[PDB]
Ligand binder design. Structure first.
Ligand code: HEM
Ligand SMILES: CC[C@@H]1C[C@@H]2C[C@@H]3[C@H]4C/C=C\C(=O)NCC[C@H](O)[C@@H]5NC(=O)/C(=C(O)/C=C/[C@@H]4CC(=O)[C@H]3[C@@H]2[C@H]1C)C5=O
Length: 391
């Protein structure tokens, strides 16, 4: 009878069971659905799972995917492939997410952030930072980049939520797939009759003109980016803001030393356990040793990035949020092939958010007692339903 995973925790709590597991050999756990799997929790082990070619993201041996969602996570996009096939598909998007291209979006990200905060401030204190900023701004950034109009943003929230909900059935996934395919089918036909200088338009040229990808691959890449690209940052804006507002000095360290905002963002990326459970298991493609256990060909191992980010040998006093830490590189954006393609855009968003909040609301504080905060309970991610803030 195996340890159950995910573990018990509420909000952004890091559960004490990890402190036990760091002093144990690799541990096998049973999941809500699918096969059992080992839990990689040491920094080095999580790095290995995510970047060593002996770990495949594909269950090519009949495995039942260890998971928290009733419907297995399957499709034709970036999370369904190993290199080189993954690398060839990702290369279609690559150039648009390099630091050199994303750094160009800083001014636009701040424009949208400013518009969000004008409306927040016009709504009056105390106001919900989730509804006024965390949700709208990242949604607008990627929906604009892709070429989706503001009228339709709500459609992509719903499609993204059913992906991320652990009570989503395979039937719900079918409904989502059909609705989404219809919508992007419309978008494709629009761009075939009238090309556009946006990212979906780039994908349509890549399918039609260059023949680099197939239609289903074009849809898959768009679906990956519109599922992953704004609910993520949405959750993290509120998580980061809540983390800061819960300390005695709140925003003041960053008001006083704006130049430290990039380091703060990285420490928060390390510290915040953003995942309720985990992402994708990997499967060993040959016998190998990990934290005292022989992982056999075919067996699943889950990379627990949150645990890696509190590895007691990599990070002294790991539970402490120390905005000056500059610890060794966290795994909050993953590692290896599937390292977050949006990593620099998320850094830009989160940095700009802290710039805008410190500059405009230096005395930002919780608008309700902290004990009343409404943390989510059944989402793939940890976060807040609401974040009332006062100034
Ligand atoms: C704070 C915000 C974000 C966090 C914490 C985050 C985290 C991650 C992590 C850890 C992975 C790797 C998971 C694994 O290997 O199992 C990943 C993958 C991915 N992320 Fe991000 N992400 C964020 C924002 C974004 C944004 C802004 C985008 C795009 C606009 C994005 C798009 C993607 C995509 C497409 C993948 C799959 C990449 C691949 O398999 O090649 N994410 N994300
Ligand atoms: C902030 C935390 C970041 C946020 C990103 C978003 C990532 C999720 C969404 C990513 C891609 C996606 O939804 N693409 C279209 C569907 C696909 O065809 C396919 N079908 C499926 O069902 C399946 C998923 O459920 C996929 C779920 C992904 C799980 C995961 O690791 C998340 C990441 C986290 C680590 C697929 O990938």
């Amino acid at each position: 009878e195996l340890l159950t995973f995910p573990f018990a925790s509420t909000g952004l709590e890091f559960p004490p069971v990890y402190h036990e597991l760091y002093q144990q050999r690799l541990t096998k756990v049973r999941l809500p659905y699918g096969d059992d799997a080992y839990l990689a929790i040491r920094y080095a082990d999580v790095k290995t799972v995510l970047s060593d070619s002996r770990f495949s993201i594909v269950a090519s041996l009949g495995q039942d995917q260890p998971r928290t969602r009733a419907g297995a996570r399957v499709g034709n996009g970036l999370f369904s492939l190993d290199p080189p096939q993954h690398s060839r598909l990702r290369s279609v998007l690559g150039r648009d997410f390099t630091p050199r291209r994303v750094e160009k979006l800083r001014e636009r990200v701040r424009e949208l952030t400013d518009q969000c905060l004008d409306r927040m401030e016009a709504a009056g204190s105390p106001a919900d930072l989730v509804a006024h900023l965390a949700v709208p701004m990242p949604t607008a950034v990627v929906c604009e980049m892709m070429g989706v109009p503001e009228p339709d943003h709500h459609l992509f929230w719903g499609w993204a939520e059913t992906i991320l909900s652990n009570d989503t059935t395979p039937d719900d996934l079918i409904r989502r797939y059909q609705e989404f395919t219809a919508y992007m089918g419309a978008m494709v036909e629009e761009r075939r009759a009238r090309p556009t200088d946006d990212m979906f338009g780039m994908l349509v040229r890549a399918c039609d003109e260059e023949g680099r990808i197939t239609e289903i691959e074009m849809h898959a890449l768009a679906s990956d980016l519109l599922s992953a690209g704004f609910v993520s940052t949405a959750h993290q804006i509120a998580n980061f803001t809540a983390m800061l507002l819960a300390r005695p000095e709140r925003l003041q360290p960053l008001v006083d030393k704006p130049e430290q905002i990039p380091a703060a963002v990285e420490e928060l990326m390390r510290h915040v356990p953003i995942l309720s459970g985990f992402s994708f298991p990997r499967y060993a493609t040959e016998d190998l040793e990990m934290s005292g256990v022989t992982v056999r060909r075919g067996e699943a191992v889950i990379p627990v990035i949150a645990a890696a980010n509190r590895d007691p040998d990599v990070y002294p006093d790991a539970g402490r949020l120390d905005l000056e830490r500059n610890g060794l590189p966290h795994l909050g954006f993953g590692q290896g092939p599937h390292f977050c393609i949006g990593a620099h855009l998320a850094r830009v968003e989160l940095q700009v958010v802290l710039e805008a909040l410190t500059e405009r609301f230096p005395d930002l504080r919780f608008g309700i007692p902290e004990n009343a905060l409404k943390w989510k309970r059944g989402h793939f991610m940890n976060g807040l339903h609401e974040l009332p803030v006062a100034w």
